[model samples]
Target: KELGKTLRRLRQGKQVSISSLADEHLSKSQISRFERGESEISSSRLLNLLDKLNITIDEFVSTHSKTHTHFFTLLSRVRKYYAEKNVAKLLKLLEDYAHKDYESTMIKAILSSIEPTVEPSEEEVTRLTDYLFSVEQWGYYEIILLGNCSRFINYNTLFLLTKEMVTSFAYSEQNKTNKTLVTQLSINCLIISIDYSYFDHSHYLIEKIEFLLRDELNFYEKTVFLYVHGYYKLKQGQVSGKDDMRQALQIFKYLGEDALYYSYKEHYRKEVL
Candidate 1:
């Protein structure tokens, strides 16, 4: 009903009726039923209806996305500030109000990453984690939220939450957004699991992540994934994973990521032989 639901919003804003919008195309029943989400319409038909409502494809998508994603604009600002390392701006961005919503707490969480002095309270942590556990399904919001706070979230909880996240979303066929989110979440948990020395969790995650892999390059992500796996392998007594670690290091050197190449090599030599 998402599309149909948006169609209603646009048509209603224009004060158009289903019958009028349908206008010699089809019955009012078709329009009403389609929007109600109890049925479907061909792409051409939907486009025809869009012309009737004067809603451009871009406008329709923007409206739909804006509605579904909470606090997107605020998060955009937070993203900018966090990257700029503008600590004062991040702090002032909080000011006085600490409303107990995902965005509010998530803002605080982002601030904590930049300013270690700004620690989220137990209450704030509980609120966000509880929401992740309670949401009927996981989406990008939960994906982004958990990725940011994986360190703060309990190890077992992170394990279950991430495991369930992959289970529910891994098979989402060919959605570019889905692929990116899943891989990002996978690697974040993978690193955190190893960082936290929680191989029990990392081992399970590696397989699922590999199942969903898409290589966009001779690329940073794939390289990171490989070397991270190497780290995981070394930790889990899989001496063979050293090859993975070394192979990724060789990739970095060849790709001319010289800083990363040497930096990761430092860990590889220091952590293993």
Candidate 2:
């Protein structure tokens, strides 16, 4: 009873339009249902709307009850972190909130830019649905787990498939191991880079690869990633002297991670030309 009333009041007080809130991801009928108390609140959906509403969980939950949500202090700071675009601060806040249930999902989503959308596909839809129930998938992208991204509706599909290369390793042999987790974390780190590098986050879609490769990466992993890092430096024109991707090639050859070696080789060939 109180939840619905509080939602409607907060939304109206904040001057957040129901349609735009819905546009952020909720359906009008769904929002209506929530406001009417006809639907149970889903944390993912709640976070999505609250993100758009620019309200903290405490403000939201406290509006209904005298007691604020348990993590209101933390949520207040994180919402402020995002609002301020203090990525460093946000990262630290995320580190603190990373293990909590609801906040963790928003953390994964924010850290990785895996916002839920209305995309139609067996995998996409299932992942979107699962966000309501699964904590691990809360903030991570579905394509990340599946490695089936469609970033460039234009031509460079190969450029986007790079993440899938890392994802394949995560799903292949070592289930629940750091091997896979480290890659995913690396990809998330790259996502952070992209978020800062350009005004638009879409430019560095391959970052999804980092999340798949972030933990306990072996010698070959470091070598392979240094090459990837070099390529990024080159792309940003940050490299000094005459730019040559030879270093990336040499490392790839050394490690014999043929999949990325060839895929990137092809991408370099196409993109450079």
Candidate 3:
């Protein structure tokens, strides 16, 4: 779909009403005209609208690849769906469009880690099972799974699953699992599921990692661990976590993630001050 159409569709999907849309810093009639392709959109104005809707530049470049290209569209979509917790649609898209064997392997590996209870589709089951043994996804892995099951399930089930996911992930990192991947999965799952009470489990996981689970981590894992801990802590109104950020900055310095490091620094500084 075209960018304008995609924007309109996503906004509608989010149930953003016209008045709500206008209050987002544009008039309702102007937004309607933009959606209908009746006006020329300045890039700055378009970016503002995108920010209001939480749409990323990466998503824009990916979806509009005919005008400009980047890494595989499947990868972009996978990342987007992972963040959005729209697992079913992402899975179907992956099933239909993934052709590269390595990409297929990663997708199934991701699915196994996040949704082990799900029966794989007929076409992907063999590969899915093959990967299920080698790679395990974390709790964020299961966000899509719970989403697949729908929000209708009882709260207790959601609560237990979240508790188990956070616990297993923290424990697994201290043992043999890839701590970096676990941290990423845990963070993503927490962000996507924030509206649900089980979201508190993300906080539990963060505290455990900082206090008890720091020993077994690698340089990269430690960086993401503190970065995300600080990131989420800022989100939660606990600005004191910034005191714990130097090690993350050290790693970011070594790895040349200055942009990300400083970006987060600015984010925390603004929110906390």
Candidate 4:
């Protein structure tokens, strides 16, 4: 039962029983021997058993083997490449971990962002949109994905839909912990409202967001507010709007928000002067 103990330990660690796992593909006696170390198990059979427990073979090996932890190692690489926008390296890393059923939706979102050198098609945009509210409340990665691909989607429609979703969640006591989610989604809505020239809504949302964030604002949050506020002022023919935008640009540059920094700078030149 020596080898059997390891197998039993792994199974118990997952809180599953041998009898519960045996089916057409695996038998109880075979499992007992494999766990007992009375008999050796075939690699394919072991993999099938692991899959039944929703554990990837790589993760199992990583737990037992002291030297390697490919699953998390690759996940760290994925995040690094994502931050750098190095789609080539990101795609390669994703391919290596594609065998494991991990973060498939998030992976697809990243691919949707990178594919097609031109603007996303209606079909592709719809695909990305599906993920925005795929869960009960959007998380950080979801917000990041939607924001990254914002250029390709229809801003007004997305803004309204997101507003409704945010509204629904805002009243729920259970969703209070999702304040970050509310803040990010509201920021996106505010930006789009300004772009669509919905000045009244943008202004109202600005005040609301400011109250919500108060001293909790981070660099990114502060930059978004400044940029949108500046644009609002510029639309009203206020000369000081340029000053707000200029300061916002400096913050974006300091934060290495290159895409947003360059984007706002170009818009400033075209719209301000």
Candidate 5:
């Protein structure tokens, strides 16, 4: 799929032609067939073609690889669902992959983690967390799990786990592609710390999250950031937090996030004197 897309972009978008792309290493018909994804191109020829496009093979592969692109796209969709707290649609999307082997396991672990429960077993938490680490998906899983289960888990366990996650993610050098995941993780950690009344810790995480996110927040992320800032300021006895809370509440209402708007209201009433 990606090979064809690359070929089409180079040929049609850039106005390159099959005849010009062809050489001793590749034939005109072969180039045409490759552009249509009807035939596979040899590595040497693919490399030669990439040279003509003035891009490295690494750039081509990074931008156009179907498997890698598809996985990250799906991950983004999953995050959007989490941001909207649309667990039912997310669960259905995950269940569609239930027949796949590795994805099935990850989906099941995420499903179990999000399932409503007052007390999730230690074993279940271990299994899910372990699976996330094994698959290098902890960055995505940790925040979503905490956002959904913060009030239900054992406070001690949650505190320790979040402290470890927050500290570890802070020091670790994540891939540039994972900036969004790291940003979301940091924000969710701030939320959890606030939820548990770890005001000092929340204050620390709030700075870290702002530094990581900088000016790149989308609407949902910005709303959450504002809410966290409001909560932190109120905890610090700053009345200006009320304005931040009001702005965040307006955004939530505009987004039709009734659950979050009400939840934020409750937190404001309880946390703000």
Candidate 6:
């Protein structure tokens, strides 16, 4: 209902007073009235005021526009809820959007891991993999989807996509969130390859992931990277990996991440021990 403050803020940003901003076509009092919302300015009057303030009509419109929930916004909600394990919120996202052929289907596939009632549909999983193949240049959206649904995707397809994603990687091109997602995906790719007992791919991923571990991760993520690398080494018959695993788990425990500590520990006992 009220949008004057935003416009006023920009005029203030330029540090131009009403008397200075006033023009021959627009009076000083009229401009002041418009800023105070005391009077409605004409169509051309609005544009002229923006011009004096050096703010474009397009920029002004965007200032008041609110983005609806779409794939762009949905991915963040989905990912956050996924990590938080808020299955209830995840389902609510579906009801929030009526659109088909995108988020709903993708989300269902994501829910497959925790939702025993909903299996990752054959159609949904296939279409997702097909879409990744269709994408010429992968971004945060593509990487996040593939990473979450990695286990459901075919080994060869996942491997190819991982390789392509790595080869196509541009660290500077990504934002902080993008960097973290790609990092998580890379570490996950390495772990899944090992789980499949495909040492060749695991070996390949281990080498790449080991080096690709950049400055993006927090201490927790660093240890996650370290723990996984350690797991790979232990699998390769290297005695040093155990130390890395132990050290990482200790950090996890220190951080009070009971889930990671226990799960990683369980993995160690079942596989390494």
lDDT of each: 0.77, 0.53, 0.57, 0.68, 0.66, 0.77
lDDT of 3 by residue, 199-233 (tens): 46667656655543456545665666676666566
TM-score of each candidate? 0.69, 0.32, 0.36, 0.52, 0.60, 0.72
Which candidate should be chosen as best, given TM-score against the real structure?
A: 6
Q: What is the C-alpha lDDT profile of model 5 across 19-86, one tens digit per residue?
A: 78777768988777877778887888888887886777766776676466554566677768777877
Models ranked on lDDT: 1, 6, 4, 5, 3, 2
Task: For model 5, state the Cα shift of residue 269 in Å.
Answer: 3.7
Question: Could you give candidate 2's per-residue lDDT for residues 1-273 as a string of tens digits?
Answer: 567778888899878778877764568888889888888767898888878888888678766785554454655675676677666776676567645533544444454433233122344334433443343321233333222222311122222333443444446555444344445444434434433463133234445444544564464555545555655565566663114456666667777768867876786676543
Residue 13 of model 5, lDDT score: 66
Q: What TM-score quantifies how close candidate 6 is to the native fold?
A: 0.72
The reply for model 3, stretches above 4 Å from the true place, is 1-162, 167-180, 189-203, 210-212, 231-239
lDDT of 3 at 31: 74
Segments of candidate 2 deviating more than 4 angstroms: 1-179, 182-217, 240-245, 256-259
Pairs that collide, model 1: none
RMSD of 4: 9.7
Candidate 1 regions with alpha-carbon error over 4 angstroms = 1-70, 171-174, 195-197, 214-220, 256-263
Question: What is the Cα-based TM-score of model 3?
Answer: 0.36
Give the lDDT of residue 93 in candidate 4: 58
- Give the better candidate number (2 or 3) by lDDT: 3
Error of 4 at 222 (Å): 2.3
> Residue 211 of candidate 4: its Cα lDDT?
62
Model 3 gets an lDDT of 0.57
